[PDB]
Paper text:
In order to compensate for the high degree of beam-induced motion and lower image quality resulting from increased sample thickness in our tilted samples, data were collected at a high frame rate and processed using a tilt-optimized version of MotionCor222. Using this approach, we were able to resolve PhuN assemblies in 2D arrays to ~3.9 Å and build an atomic model starting with predictions from RoseTTAFold15 and AlphaFold16. PhuN assembles into a tetrameric lattice with a dimeric asymmetric unit, giving rise to p2 symmetry with a unit cell length and angle of 120 Å and 100°, respectively. Each core tetramer is held together by the tight packing of four monomers with both domains contributing, while interactions between the tetramers are looser and predominantly coupled via highly flexible elements (loops, termini, etc.). Alignment of the p2 asymmetric subunit models using the acetyltransferase-like domain results in an RMSD of ~2 Å for all Cα and 0.77 Å for the core Cα. The bulk of the differences between the structured domains of asymmetric subunits appears to arise from small shifts in helices as well as interconnecting loops. The central Diamond channel is lined by the four smaller PhuN domains of the core tetramer. The resulting diamond-shaped opening has a highly negative charge and measures 32 Å by 33 Å across the corners. In an elegant domain swap that holds the subunits tightly packed around the channel, a small positively charged helix within the N-terminal 37 residues of the nuclease domain threads into the neighboring subunit, nestling at the top within a negatively charged pocket. Deleting the 37 N-terminal residues abrogated PhuN incorporation into the phage nuclear shell in vivo and resulted in no clear assembly in vitro. This suggests that the N-terminal residues are necessary for the formation of the core tetramer and further assembly.
Author numbering:
A (entry chain E): 591 to 602
B (entry chain A): 19 to 275, 288 to 555
C (entry chain B): 205 to 275, 288 to 403
D (entry chain C): 19 to 204
Write the structure that this text describes.
Amino acid sequence: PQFGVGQGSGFY
Amino acid sequence: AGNLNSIFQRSGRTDGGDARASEALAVFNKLKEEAIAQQDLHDDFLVFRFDRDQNRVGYSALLVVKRAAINGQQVIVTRPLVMPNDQITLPTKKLTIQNGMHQETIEAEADVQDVFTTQYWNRICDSIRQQTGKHDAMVINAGPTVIPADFDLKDELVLKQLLIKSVNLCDDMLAKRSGEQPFSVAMLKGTDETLAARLNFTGKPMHDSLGYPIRSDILVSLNRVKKPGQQENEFYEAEDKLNQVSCFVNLEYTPQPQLPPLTPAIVITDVRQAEWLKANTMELYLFALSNAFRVTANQSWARSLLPQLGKVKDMRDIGAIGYLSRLAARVETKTETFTDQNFAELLYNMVRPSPVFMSDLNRFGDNAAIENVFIDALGGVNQQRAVAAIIAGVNNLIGGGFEKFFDHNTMPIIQPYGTDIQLGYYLDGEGEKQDRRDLDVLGALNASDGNIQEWMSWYGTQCNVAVHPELRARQSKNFDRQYLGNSVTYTTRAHRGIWNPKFIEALDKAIASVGLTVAMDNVAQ
Amino acid sequence: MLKGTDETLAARLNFTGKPMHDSLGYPIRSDILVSLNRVKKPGQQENEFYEAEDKLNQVSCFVNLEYTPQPQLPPLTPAIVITDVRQAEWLKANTMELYLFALSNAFRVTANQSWARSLLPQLGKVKDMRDIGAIGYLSRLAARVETKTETFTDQNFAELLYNMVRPSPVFMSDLNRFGDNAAIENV
Amino acid sequence: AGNLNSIFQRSGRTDGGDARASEALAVFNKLKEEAIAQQDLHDDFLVFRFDRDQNRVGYSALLVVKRAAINGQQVIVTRPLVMPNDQITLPTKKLTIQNGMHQETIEAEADVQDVFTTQYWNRICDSIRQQTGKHDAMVINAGPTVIPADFDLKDELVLKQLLIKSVNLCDDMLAKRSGEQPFSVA
């Protein structure tokens, strides 16, 4: 139902 | 207590690290050196061990690390390689499920999705700084992946290739942070060059960076842009390929309040550039995705559903479709009286004419640095940023104008499919690895041999997402033991989503509209 | 740095019948291992992301007996002898402050009469050396006390201590110029 | 592919290519080190790889390289060692011959003289420059040679001598470039 977000990088 | 790490780590070194992270470091350092000796790898970088003992993770990992200073900022790009250890159990998480008025808790092991928390990453960054000396560095996430406990560590070839691929990606991300120029149709659009493409009805699986099989019914091959009459590049031999997309088509049994009952669910399972190209960027990915669209837009995917006539062991034989149809029976497809015309009729009555395009999304896959933007684009705190990155990537391909087809803020690029994906493989009668996804709708109908009640119990498990996913995962595993066999190994899980039809319209039309014409090789069926 | 608002300490006295080993694998005698742990309130903890342990430090003590005849007091005066001082394996540093904090673990081994458990008999041993029944040779009995058998009671044990062992031990320690703590022990 | 390779070869590396060429690079590296240890050769030269999957080559080669700055010009001197492989098929020339009144075609595999074209040389120039970092250097062709497909790589003596001789030829060409005084009857 919800979207968790990990520590992505470069694009943001 | 956890704040005593500020004292614990102030000075000195210790004797520690798990047996797999120890062995993994030793083989990876060996491989680095051989790659340098053979001149395949450049000697500009470091490999590091991240310990569960020395620092704050549940699972140890090796870190593929490269660095450069970019416009005064120290930048490090890291691609973690998780090392699960079969002898080490991390305390489980409590999954409390509110089943209406009944509350029950299931305890379960943390998978790489649960392990790779935001703090897990932040701890990886801190350890690297301790190991590189770059205490003020910024660290780029190239996407964690995992090298599973199960197999023997002696496969130097694969391990070498993992380092090679991981450093490739690290160089890309330093470059793209450095402002490197994007992939575009303009680079392909020689004034004397054109594209062409075909659908491969493979008869075989394709394999990820660790050698595990990936389901594909159709491999779409986009030919190298070129033209007869161009200057030949000396005495050369090459495959005329630019890129490819791996996909499969299921037949989902879907609701209706006149359409037939099954949906042609076209699923992308992998996106690859031709092997001669080294870089992996969003523009390259996005351009290749147009390969799946053409599967149903210009050509007809339904050929992939033909039964393997003459082969007794076809677990996904189309004849099974008769169990969901009004026949409530397997269609006799073993017989000399079964024709192409009869096949088409089964589909006329059972399968909807309008294709649906969706794809897997895997934060831990071979393309994780990129998969992550497409995943965050599904929803969450940074959806707007992920979407902005994706639309920018297509505009880089076409020179602007994606926005002339649709509003990305009214039409988010990828929607959730809800039911997520359990990945794994099973062994066949000769011991080969096959994708567990084979028990799809036709697969499951044959597995139960027409027992529709058994099929529907399974089918509801794979569709009703009001049911907590742990409950669904347990029943999915129960069904594999009964129908697939006990020789089943589970691997890293993944998300699925639906590509917005307007994203698709804009990508395909925008490329065609700027003149990068592609011919179909299968000019007529 | 230890006084967390969500953190307190607690300790356990271990009476197990096994030795410790030093830095080159040689045995160390002790009767009691005093283990001091960090206890946190069950809210958010750093360990939500990792396997974790609460050991802070440990002091290993031996319980001795000094014979002090009076030509009255029970003839044997016990002592708590520190045979080793260690920090938890999590802490790489070894300093004076850490050593001193850990020493408070020996002090607490004498809470109540816990330290005297080291003087008990233990299971099934036909002829073995730390048997309290040997104490009967210095006491009026001039004989070994039948302590290893099914006819020896808890009450008889308590009586051997009441008459032969003084209830309050002397604290002392062994300082090794060449041990791993030598930088500190030499002070 | 060439329009893309400009930038998408820059980021990342791969494995692959002819195993015989990899063996040849490895035996030369071994011999190089033995020669340094025994003081037969100075550790002042580099050996690079020229390979199929990167350069679309026809035949693979090892490249022996020396460098000097001569009157301000950075100069790279090299001697390629071409490596044919009996297990690898090479594309042929289609030779149309007017045999009297009728044209017939004979196909033949390109030989080392057909493969080592001016452009092959230009790609050697560029490949070495990228591996040495001297992107604006002038490159001297010291005269290539060949290590034929047919035979055991077990003749370390021959391979050692080829390396020594290649190094010497490279030095003579730099010496010419720098104005070294000629041999004369004087």
